[PDB]
C-alpha cells in the first residue's frame, strides 16, 4: 500500500504499518510526536517506562483540561499523561518494524524512527441513554498508524 | 409525475422545538420519520409546477 | 407463555427457522449481492408482537 513521503534511501530503510486499530487518536498523536526522531532501542526502553509511570508523555496540541505532572519537565512542558494502551499498541509495532529490518538485512540496533504519522479511521458507533428519553451516541475514534525506519550512517 | 410527494400523510409540527415550519412526516421507527415532506425544498418532494 | 394455543407455536416455529444465517456457498453464485441475512431477528432489540 501507499505511504506519505516514501523514504530518501529505500535500500537501507525499513517500513511498517497498522490500520483500523482501536486506540484513541488523541492519545496516540501526542505519543507518536514524543518519539518522532528517537533511536529505536531508546524508544523501546522509553515506551516501557511510559506504561510503568516512570517517564511521561507530554500533551501539546490535544490538552484540553489535561492535568499537570512532574515528569514533563524533561520535555520542557507543564502537562502530561501516561497512556499505557496508546503507548502499548505502537510498542508492538516497533517489534513489527524490527522484524522487517532483519528480513531486509539491517542492523536493528542502529535505526531511528524517521517518520511517523497517526491519522484517523472511520469512527464506529454505538449509543448512550440520556435524560428525557433521548439518545446520544458513543463513537470511538480508531487510528491509522504508519512508520518509516531509517538509520543514520 | 402524476402525483409525486403528495402520496404521503404529513403535517407541520406547528409549535416550537427549534425546527423550521416545513411539514414533517409522522410516525416513528424507520429513518423517514420526522423528515421534511412535500414542498420543492425537500428531499422526496413534489417539484415546483408539477408539469401538466 | 407456557400455555399457548396450537396456532401460536406453528407461528413461532416459522419465526425460529428463518433466524438463521446465509450459507457460505450462496455468496459464491453468479450474480448475487446479498452478503448477510438482514431479516435476522434478535429477541431483545426487536420482538415479534404475537
Amino acid at each position: 500500500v501507499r505511504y506519505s513521503l516514501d523514504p530518501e534511501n529505500p535500500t537501507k530503510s525499513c517500513k511498517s504499518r497498522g490500520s483500523n486499530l482501536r486506540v484513541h487518536f488523541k492519545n496516540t498523536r501526542e505519543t507518536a510526536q514524543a518519539i518522532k526522531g528517537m533511536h529505536i532501542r531508546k524508544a523501546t526502553k522509553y515506551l516501557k517506562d511510559v506504561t510503568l509511570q516512570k517517564q511521561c508523555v507530554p500533551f501539546r496540541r490535544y490538552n484540553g483540561g489535561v492535568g499537570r505532572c512532574a515528569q514533563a519537565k524533561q520535555w520542557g512542558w507543564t502537562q502530561g499523561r501516561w497512556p499505557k494502551k496508546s503507548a502499548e499498541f505502537l510498542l508492538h509495532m516497533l517489534k513489527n518494524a524490527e522484524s522487517n529490518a532483519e528480513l531486509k538485512g539491517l542492523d536493528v540496533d542502529s535505526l531511528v524512527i524517521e517518520h511517523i504519522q497517526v491519522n484517523k479511521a472511520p469512527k464506529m458507533r454505538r449509543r448512550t441513554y440520556r435524560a428525557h428519553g433521548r439518545i446520544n451516541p458513543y463513537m470511538s475514534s480508531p487510528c491509522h498508524i504508519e512508520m518509516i525506519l531509517t538509520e543514520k550512517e | 409525475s402524476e402525483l409525486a410527494g403528495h402520496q404521503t400523510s404529513a403535517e407541520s409540527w406547528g409549535t416550537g422545538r427549534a425546527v423550521a415550519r416545513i411539514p414533517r412526516v409522522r410516525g416513528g421507527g424507520t429513518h423517514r420519520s420526522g423528515q421534511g415532506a412535500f414542498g420543492n425544498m425537500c428531499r422526496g418532494g413534489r417539484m415546483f409546477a408539477p408539469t401538466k | 407463555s407456557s400455555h399457548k394455543t396450537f396456532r401460536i407455536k406453528r407461528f413461532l416455529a416459522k419465526k425460529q427457522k428463518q433466524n438463521r444465517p446465509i450459507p457460505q456457498w450462496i455468496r459464491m453464485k453468479t450474480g448475487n449481492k446479498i452478503r448477510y441475512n438482514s431479516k435476522r431477528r434478535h429477541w431483545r432489540r426487536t420482538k415479534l408482537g404475537l
Binding site: 458507533r125 428525557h132 428519553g133 433521548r134 439518545i135 | 409549535t15 416550537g16 422545538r17 410516525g27 416513528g28 421507527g29 424507520t30 429513518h31 423517514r32 420519520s33 420526522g34 | 444465517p21 446465509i22 452478503r35 448477510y36 441475512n37 438482514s38 435476522r40 434478535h42 432489540r45
Partner: peptide, 26 residues
C-alpha cells in the same frame, strides 16, 4: 465475517417545550 446489524432510526418521541409556563403577572 459477521453480517452488518441494527443501526435503526432513533424515532425519538416528542417532549414538552420550555418547561414551566411561568410568565409575567404584570
Amino acid at each position: 465475517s459477521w453480517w452488518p446489524l441494527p443501526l435503526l432510526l432513533l424515532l425519538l418521541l416528542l417532549l414538552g417545550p420550555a418547561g414551566a409556563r411561568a410568565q409575567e403577572d404584570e
